[PDB]
Design a protein around this ligand. Structure first.
Ligand SMILES: O=P(O)(O)O[C@H]1[C@H](OP(=O)(O)O)[C@@H](OP(=O)(O)O)[C@H](OP(=O)(O)O)[C@@H](OP(=O)(O)O)[C@H]1OP(=O)(O)O
Length: 151
Protein backbone atom coordinates (compact mmCIF):
# COMPACT_ATOMS: atom_id res chain seq x y z
CA UNK A 1 0.00 0.00 0.00
CA UNK A 2 1.11 3.53 -0.98
CA UNK A 3 0.88 4.80 2.60
CA UNK A 4 3.12 2.03 4.06
CA UNK A 5 5.65 2.78 1.35
CA UNK A 6 5.74 6.46 2.11
CA UNK A 7 6.18 5.65 5.84
CA UNK A 8 9.14 3.32 5.14
CA UNK A 9 10.86 5.75 2.82
CA UNK A 10 10.52 8.76 5.16
CA UNK A 11 11.65 6.77 8.25
CA UNK A 12 14.64 5.08 6.57
CA UNK A 13 15.93 8.45 5.35
CA UNK A 14 15.45 10.09 8.81
CA UNK A 15 17.41 7.29 10.40
CA UNK A 16 20.29 7.34 7.91
CA UNK A 17 20.72 11.01 8.64
CA UNK A 18 20.40 10.55 12.43
CA UNK A 19 23.11 7.89 12.38
CA UNK A 20 25.36 10.49 10.56
CA UNK A 21 24.76 12.87 13.48
CA UNK A 22 25.40 10.20 16.19
CA UNK A 23 21.93 10.29 17.69
CA UNK A 24 19.59 7.24 18.19
CA UNK A 25 17.07 6.08 15.50
CA UNK A 26 13.40 7.19 15.49
CA UNK A 27 10.58 4.65 15.51
CA UNK A 28 7.31 5.17 13.73
CA UNK A 29 4.30 5.48 15.96
CA UNK A 30 0.74 4.41 14.80
CA UNK A 31 -0.94 7.27 16.59
CA UNK A 32 1.34 9.96 15.22
CA UNK A 33 0.92 8.44 11.71
CA UNK A 34 -2.88 8.65 12.05
CA UNK A 35 -2.85 12.23 13.38
CA UNK A 36 -0.31 13.41 10.78
CA UNK A 37 -2.44 11.82 7.98
CA UNK A 38 -5.61 13.49 9.28
CA UNK A 39 -3.88 16.83 9.31
CA UNK A 40 -2.47 16.31 5.77
CA UNK A 41 -6.03 15.71 4.49
CA UNK A 42 -7.21 18.92 6.14
CA UNK A 43 -4.34 20.90 4.54
CA UNK A 44 -4.91 19.36 1.10
CA UNK A 45 -8.63 20.11 1.15
CA UNK A 46 -8.10 23.86 1.45
CA UNK A 47 -4.67 23.90 -0.23
CA UNK A 48 -3.49 25.85 2.85
CA UNK A 49 -0.11 25.40 4.53
CA UNK A 50 0.10 26.28 8.21
CA UNK A 51 1.09 24.60 11.45
CA UNK A 52 -1.40 22.66 13.58
CA UNK A 53 -2.58 23.58 17.14
CA UNK A 54 -0.66 20.59 18.45
CA UNK A 55 2.58 22.05 16.98
CA UNK A 56 1.84 25.55 18.31
CA UNK A 57 1.45 24.32 21.94
CA UNK A 58 4.47 22.03 21.86
CA UNK A 59 2.49 18.77 22.11
CA UNK A 60 4.52 17.51 19.10
CA UNK A 61 7.13 18.81 16.71
CA UNK A 62 5.95 19.22 13.10
CA UNK A 63 7.51 19.50 9.65
CA UNK A 64 5.43 20.42 6.59
CA UNK A 65 6.29 19.93 2.88
CA UNK A 66 4.53 20.78 -0.38
CA UNK A 67 4.96 19.98 -4.06
CA UNK A 68 2.87 20.25 -7.26
CA UNK A 69 3.20 16.46 -7.61
CA UNK A 70 3.02 13.33 -5.44
CA UNK A 71 6.30 13.42 -3.48
CA UNK A 72 8.39 10.40 -2.50
CA UNK A 73 9.49 9.85 1.11
CA UNK A 74 13.14 10.07 0.15
CA UNK A 75 12.59 13.36 -1.70
CA UNK A 76 10.80 14.93 1.33
CA UNK A 77 13.38 13.81 3.89
CA UNK A 78 16.33 14.87 1.64
CA UNK A 79 14.78 18.31 1.08
CA UNK A 80 14.33 18.85 4.84
CA UNK A 81 17.85 17.62 5.68
CA UNK A 82 19.41 19.87 2.93
CA UNK A 83 18.68 22.85 5.24
CA UNK A 84 21.87 21.83 7.08
CA UNK A 85 23.69 24.03 4.51
CA UNK A 86 22.25 27.03 6.32
CA UNK A 87 22.96 25.83 9.84
CA UNK A 88 25.90 27.31 11.80
CA UNK A 89 27.08 24.76 14.42
CA UNK A 90 29.11 27.53 16.14
CA UNK A 91 25.90 29.65 16.51
CA UNK A 92 23.36 27.04 17.72
CA UNK A 93 19.62 27.90 17.66
CA UNK A 94 16.44 28.10 15.59
CA UNK A 95 16.07 29.75 12.18
CA UNK A 96 13.18 29.26 9.78
CA UNK A 97 15.74 28.25 7.16
CA UNK A 98 16.97 25.30 9.24
CA UNK A 99 13.92 24.24 11.31
CA UNK A 100 13.09 21.00 9.38
CA UNK A 101 16.66 19.82 9.56
CA UNK A 102 17.02 20.52 13.30
CA UNK A 103 13.72 18.69 14.06
CA UNK A 104 14.85 15.62 12.00
CA UNK A 105 18.11 15.15 13.93
CA UNK A 106 16.97 16.38 17.39
CA UNK A 107 18.66 14.01 19.88
CA UNK A 108 15.87 13.80 22.46
CA UNK A 109 13.16 13.01 19.87
CA UNK A 110 12.27 9.30 19.86
CA UNK A 111 9.15 8.72 17.74
CA UNK A 112 7.59 10.13 14.55
CA UNK A 113 4.56 9.83 12.37
CA UNK A 114 3.97 10.91 8.82
CA UNK A 115 1.08 11.56 6.45
CA UNK A 116 0.51 12.77 2.92
CA UNK A 117 -2.58 13.86 0.97
CA UNK A 118 -3.31 15.13 -2.52
CA UNK A 119 -5.34 18.24 -3.33
CA UNK A 120 -7.89 18.56 -6.13
CA UNK A 121 -5.21 19.80 -8.54
CA UNK A 122 -2.77 16.96 -7.83
CA UNK A 123 -0.50 18.95 -5.51
CA UNK A 124 0.53 17.17 -2.34
CA UNK A 125 0.72 18.10 1.29
CA UNK A 126 2.99 16.26 3.72
CA UNK A 127 2.99 16.39 7.54
CA UNK A 128 5.59 14.81 9.88
CA UNK A 129 5.06 14.82 13.63
CA UNK A 130 7.81 14.30 16.25
CA UNK A 131 7.78 13.28 19.91
CA UNK A 132 9.11 14.47 22.29
CA UNK A 133 8.89 17.84 20.50
CA UNK A 134 12.24 19.32 19.35
CA UNK A 135 13.32 22.76 18.22
CA UNK A 136 13.10 23.99 21.80
CA UNK A 137 14.90 27.38 21.86
CA UNK A 138 15.73 27.41 25.62
CA UNK A 139 19.36 28.40 26.13
CA UNK A 140 21.66 25.47 25.40
CA UNK A 141 19.07 23.07 24.06
CA UNK A 142 20.02 23.25 20.36
CA UNK A 143 23.70 22.75 21.31
CA UNK A 144 22.72 19.60 23.33
CA UNK A 145 20.36 18.18 20.66
CA UNK A 146 21.61 19.22 17.16
CA UNK A 147 25.05 17.63 16.79
CA UNK A 148 27.50 18.08 13.91
CA UNK A 149 27.69 15.35 11.19
CA UNK A 150 30.46 12.66 11.51
CA UNK A 151 31.80 10.56 8.66
O1 LIG B 1 -3.47 -5.94 9.28
P1 LIG B 1 -2.93 -7.46 9.57
O2 LIG B 1 -3.69 -8.41 8.51
O3 LIG B 1 -2.98 -7.84 11.00
O4 LIG B 1 -1.40 -7.49 9.13
C1 LIG B 1 -0.57 -6.72 9.97
C2 LIG B 1 -0.55 -5.33 9.32
O5 LIG B 1 -0.42 -5.51 7.91
P2 LIG B 1 -1.26 -4.54 6.93
O6 LIG B 1 -0.28 -3.26 6.76
O7 LIG B 1 -1.67 -5.15 5.64
O8 LIG B 1 -2.53 -4.04 7.80
C3 LIG B 1 0.56 -4.44 9.84
O9 LIG B 1 0.67 -3.29 8.97
P3 LIG B 1 0.05 -1.86 9.47
O10 LIG B 1 -0.65 -2.01 10.76
O11 LIG B 1 1.31 -0.88 9.46
O12 LIG B 1 -0.91 -1.38 8.28
C4 LIG B 1 1.86 -5.20 9.85
O13 LIG B 1 2.90 -4.36 10.39
P4 LIG B 1 4.14 -3.92 9.45
O14 LIG B 1 3.67 -2.44 8.98
O15 LIG B 1 5.46 -3.89 10.13
O16 LIG B 1 4.13 -4.83 8.12
C5 LIG B 1 1.71 -6.39 10.74
O17 LIG B 1 2.96 -7.01 10.86
P5 LIG B 1 3.71 -7.19 12.26
O18 LIG B 1 2.63 -7.60 13.41
O19 LIG B 1 4.59 -8.51 12.02
O20 LIG B 1 4.58 -6.04 12.62
C6 LIG B 1 0.79 -7.37 10.10
O21 LIG B 1 0.71 -8.52 10.99
P6 LIG B 1 0.93 -10.01 10.48
O22 LIG B 1 1.82 -9.73 9.18
O23 LIG B 1 1.78 -10.73 11.44
O24 LIG B 1 -0.34 -10.62 10.05
Amino acid sequence: SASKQFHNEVLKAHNEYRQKHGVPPLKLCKNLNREAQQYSEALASTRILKHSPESSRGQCGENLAWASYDQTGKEVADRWYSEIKNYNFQQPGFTSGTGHFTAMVWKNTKKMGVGKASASDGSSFVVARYFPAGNVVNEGFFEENVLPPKK
